[PDB]
Design a protein around this ligand. Structure first.
Ligand SMILES: [Ca+2]
Ligand SMILES: [Ca+2]
Ligand code: NA
Ligand code: NA
Lengths: 123, 304, 161
């Protein structure tokens, strides 16, 4: 009947927290759901088997007054094997991922890059 | 006439409980939503002064499955502005792509959630405002494309100029205030009361909005000193969404537009400013109601 | 950031009318405009609930809004206030970011025993409008002065003082 875990955490600056999954199996289906419980955080949840650092070029995407959906889509799709953007529940802060091969994987729990204001667009 | 609003529909197949007011969902599904779509398109010429250089317009309400197109164009040789679309929260859904010739910055989007509630942005953030008059044609569409401010007709009349403080540069006046305004979201359904009219008495538009938890055109006398003595205060709401406010009042107002330099041969301005307390994008004054003589001629009285 | 720092408020003031001076009782009255803007992440508004950038609390005292929200805010008092103040267009705005602002046109009566009328009419005077916080330095402090409008507004004909 499925197996479930709970976690609570804090995204401090925008930069995310890593959770390690050892002994993942070929075929097994990972379900992840990330809900805001305080602050203005719009969640981003993702999966990767290799630890290469998202903060630096996500930092570089912020620097661009550039469109952006395409720029962020391209970066995300390249850095994560599967990913999803909080958008409350409208963007269904949640994914389903079937594990391609045996090994240790890591899920990323953090912030997306969004605009919050109507008075100016500064994401 | 035809009537409007929201409803709860209970459908039952071999279920006598449904005609008794009793809808608890049960059993196998038999029914749902039955069927290009319908389109809606709007003009507006937006204008971008030194005063106003970012502008946003809240869209009204797209069904999952709906496509949104928008195009800006220069009126004179004014610069191509930055265009984008966004949700009510400000998360971006699109950007403006400047076109093949380079005369129109166009943008495109079709809709995800069972409510998409979109917001269009255009900015003249790009350069220093040289004479502050570059103006644009904005085209918009889905497939009343923009949700509009409901329109209030305000009226005022004065019965007595009852005090003038020459030292402190203020005065006092007695008068009558009326606002009438048609908002469907106000709508009273008649069988509850058994009447055409619902009355709220002895309270401030503000207070009634709070009680009802909806938006209303609240206001303040701009230069009011302290408190105002308001009598025959009332707000009327009919079923239709037609609404009215009536208030005789006695208010004390600061007017530093006084100059007493050529006293007694001076002349003066008594200005009674009534501002709203909500932006232009929700309510605006649209008409002036001459509901009575504006200034009430008792001439013997005489001081001013 | 290993020690907990006071969040930093930028306050601003401007006067529109010097409307009363009581020379006997050594006080005066003034009409003006008060603004405090201050960034506190702890009332972060998440946008999809309201469907807006802005959350507004209107017609109440920072104190009262803190009480309603049950969190800490930079409340203040005009220091030498006599009796009550007539406050209009009162409001406090909070965006998602934790950026917050207070706006209040007011009409207040202030005790100034810094009056000396010894060389009347050749006397000169100080109208001081002191705005203290009501919370210590270790929670909130004033960090900037906002020149949001002309501080004193030049109508020169008016003339008494
Ligand atoms: Ca003294
Ligand atoms: Ca004057
Ligand atoms: Na009089
Ligand atoms: Na005076």
């Amino acid at each position: 009947e499925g197996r479930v875990q709970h976690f609570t955490g804090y995204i401090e600056d925008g930069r995310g927290i890593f959770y390690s999954l050892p002994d993942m199996k070929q075929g097994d289906i990972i379900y992840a759901s990330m809900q805001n419980t305080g602050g203005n955080l719009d969640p981003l949840v993702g999966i990767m088997a290799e630890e290469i650092d998202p903060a630096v070029s996500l930092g570089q995407v912020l620097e661009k007054a550039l469109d952006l959906i395409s720029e962020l889509t391209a970066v995300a799709d390249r850095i994560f094997l599967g990913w999803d953007d909080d958008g409350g529940k409208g963007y269904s802060a949640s994914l389903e991922f079937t594990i391609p091969r045996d090994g240790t994987y890591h899920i990323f729990a953090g912030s997306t890059i969004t605009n919050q204001r109507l008075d100016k667009f500064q994401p | 006439t035809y009537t409007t609003g929201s409803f709860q529909l209970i459908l039952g197949l071999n279920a006598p409980q449904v005609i008794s007011g009793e809808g608890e969902p049960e059993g196998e599904v038999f029914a749902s939503l039955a069927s290009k779509p319908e389109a809606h398109v709007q003009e507006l010429e937006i204008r971008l002064d030194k005063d106003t250089r970012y502008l946003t317009q809240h869209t009204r309400n797209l069904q999952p499955g709906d496509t949104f197109h928008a195009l800006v164009e220069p009126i004179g040789e004014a610069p191509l502005p930055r265009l984008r679309l966004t949700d009510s929260g400000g998360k971006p859904l699109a950007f403006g792509l400047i076109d093949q010739p380079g005369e129109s910055v166009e943008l495109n989007y079709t809709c995800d959630q069972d409510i998409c509630e979109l917001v269009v942005h255009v900015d003249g953030t790009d350069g220093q405002k040289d004479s502050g008059e570059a103006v644009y044609r904005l085209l918009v569409g889905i497939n009343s494309v923009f949700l509009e401010s409901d329109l209030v007709t305000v009226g005022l009349a004065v019965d007595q100029i009852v005090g003038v403080d020459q030292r402190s540069e203020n005065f006092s006046v007695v008068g009558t205030l009326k606002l009438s305004w048609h908002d469907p979201k106000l709508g009273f359904s008649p069988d509850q009361c058994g009447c055409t009219v619902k009355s709220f008495e002895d309270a401030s538009i503000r207070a009634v909005a709070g009680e009802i938890n909806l938006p209303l055109p609240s206001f303040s006398f701009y230069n009011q000193q302290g408190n105002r003595w308001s009598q025959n205060q009332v707000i009327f709401v009919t079923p239709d969404g037609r609404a009215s406010y009536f208030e005789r009042f006695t208010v004390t107002l600061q007017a530093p537009d006084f100059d007493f330099l050529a006293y007694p041969f001076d002349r003066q301005k008594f200005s009674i400013k009534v501002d709203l307390a909500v932006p232009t994008n929700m309510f605006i004054f649209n008409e002036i109601e001459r509901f009575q003589q504006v200034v009430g001629d008792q001439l013997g009285e005489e001081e001013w």
